Ligand binder design. Sequence first.
Ligand SMILES: C[C@H](CS)C(=O)N1CCC[C@H]1C(=O)O
Ligand SMILES: [Zn+2]
Ligand SMILES: [Zn+2]
Ligand SMILES: [Zn+2]
Length: 232
Amino acid sequence: EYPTVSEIPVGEVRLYQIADGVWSHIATQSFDGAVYPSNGLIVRDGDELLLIDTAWGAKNTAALLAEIEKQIGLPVTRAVSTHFHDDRVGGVDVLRAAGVATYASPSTRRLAEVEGNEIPTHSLEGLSSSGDAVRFGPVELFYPGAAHSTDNLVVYVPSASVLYGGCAIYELSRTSAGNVADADLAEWPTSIERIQQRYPEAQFVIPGHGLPGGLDLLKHTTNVVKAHTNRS
Ligand SMILES: C[C@H](CS)C(=O)N1CCC[C@H]1C(=O)O
Ligand SMILES: [Zn+2]
Ligand SMILES: [Zn+2]
Ligand SMILES: [Zn+2]
């Protein structure tokens, strides 16, 4: 029942209810002639909504806000970008123009600026050291260490036992490494083990791209990362 590319036209976003007060958003974009899905998260925060990640670009993110407005009808007051890439901060200007307070760690804000990407306005302190966690309303933000990127954060919704791994966690169907240009291949397995150690009770695990699963997605990603590391 989870939305895949065939169900999402160009420029549109679908929402998927994972648990009470927790949804994923799914959008698509083309890269080198192939179509990729991308996931973000929506977490109910009292009578407001916390958004995790843009929908990968200004068009998709405008569609994201319209679909949230249409389907949930609660204001998106804060957004957190979980790393500096365009599927996470692309669309931050649309969020900002719509009154959403956009947040990212200083590490992500720094890397986004270097890359010429959009820059969330607010800074999330307390996340610069591997193993650091901070509460952000209905979620915990966790910096597990460098993996897919040096700044990647994961998000845990304790009320629903939902772990959102972002692009540091691969879906099961991905059996070879994706974009590792900004990755720390040497530290990625150790970072995944920090996630496993902190959230062993997680019931739902959302990769940045593709189908949700359980905690097996962590070991899966480690397997794929180690196989890529040993490419000969
Ligand atoms: C925009 C995302 C950020 S994790 C990305 O790097 N992608 C998504 C498509 C494949 C790969 C690439 O561009 O190389
Ligand atoms: Zn990325
Ligand atoms: Zn990604
Ligand atoms: Zn696997």
